[PDB]
């Protein structure tokens, strides 16, 4: 429509809109950003290098007083879609990422209300480093966190706020290997810094053990059960050495395979 393109031109006019300046009025007031993580799939947990992969929708909401208009003057339009690459954005990133991919994947449009409210919901494939606890494998429960921070503006310029106390599962696809237990979010400050603020989500996940039970534990027990037979084997049959050496071989192989799967680090060794 002619009115819509007139409004889009007027709002983004680079003469009167600089996308590199924070939308703070009254001098040194802060811009409040609401944050909310929605989980779509838990793509994979790779225990070997300690990385969790997720498909999440990162909802961000803030106010930009420079993107206001009067609906009566623009055919009574209440909101418009602006490209998020040409407006000011809070540089909210996954701070504890692995492989160095801080940002979101797509950079969708932003929905702008006439009162200045910005709504942004870009999808992202994230890789986050989380410590793996191997002690109780394959009945282990992991606690992998996602930490979100503005790497440009400190706590004095933008304050992060949680839209909800938990991450959403409204559009989740169940994993099939990992069970979701809890996804609580928390807002953290440093009492000795005063410029630090972040929002962190804990993903408590529980492994479904049937696969590794069937494929690792039962064979291990079967091989271990043969460790004793050598002493009931008569010395005349001439097969004691074959039995005991074969058992030792199988045990060494299973140890090496399990170590490839779930590495024993210093803090804990798998039972």
């Amino acid at each position: 429509t002619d009115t819509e393109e007139r409004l889009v031109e007027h709002l983004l006019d680079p003469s009167r809109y600089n996308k590199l300046i924070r939308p703070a009025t009254n001098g040194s007031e802060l811009v409040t950003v609401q944050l909310m993580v929605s989980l779509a799939q838990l793509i994979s947990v790779h225990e070997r290098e300690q990385i969790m992969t997720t498909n999440v929708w990162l909802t961000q909401e803030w106010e930009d007083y420079r993107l206001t208009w009067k609906p009566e003057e623009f055919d009574n339009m209440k909101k418009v879609r602006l490209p998020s690459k040409h407006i000011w954005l809070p540089d909210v990133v996954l701070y504890n990422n692995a492989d160095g991919m801080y940002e979101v994947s797509f950079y969708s449009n932003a929905v702008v209300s006439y009162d200045g409210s910005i709504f942004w919901l870009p999808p992202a494939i994230y890789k986050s480093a989380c410590k793996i606890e191997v002690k109780h494998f394959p009945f282990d429960q992991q606690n992998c966190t996602m930490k979100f921070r503005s790497w440009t503006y400190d706590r004095t310029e933008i304050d992060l706020v949680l839209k909800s106390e938990v991450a959403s599962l409204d559009d989740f696809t169940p994993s099939g290997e990992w069970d979701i237990v809890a996804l609580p979010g928390r807002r953290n400050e440093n009492p000795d810094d005063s410029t630090y603020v972040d929002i962190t989500y804990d993903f408590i996940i529980r492994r479904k053990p049937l696969f590794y039970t069937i494929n690792l534990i039962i064979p291990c027990v079967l091989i271990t059960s043969l460790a004793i037979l050598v002493f009931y084997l008569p010395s005349d049959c001439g097969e004691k050495m074959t039995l005991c050496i074969s058992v030792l071989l199988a045990l060494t192989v299973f140890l090496l395979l399990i170590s490839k799967i779930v590495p024993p680090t210093s803090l804990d060794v798998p039972l």
Binding site: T224, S225, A227, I228, F231, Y232, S235
Partner: peptide, 16 residues
């Protein structure tokens, strides 16, 4: 080897 069979059965049971 009977004595050691006893000992190893004991230790394998404790392995549980």
């Amino acid at each position: 080897d009977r004595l050691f069979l006893w000992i190893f059965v004991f230790v394998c049971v404790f392995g549980t």
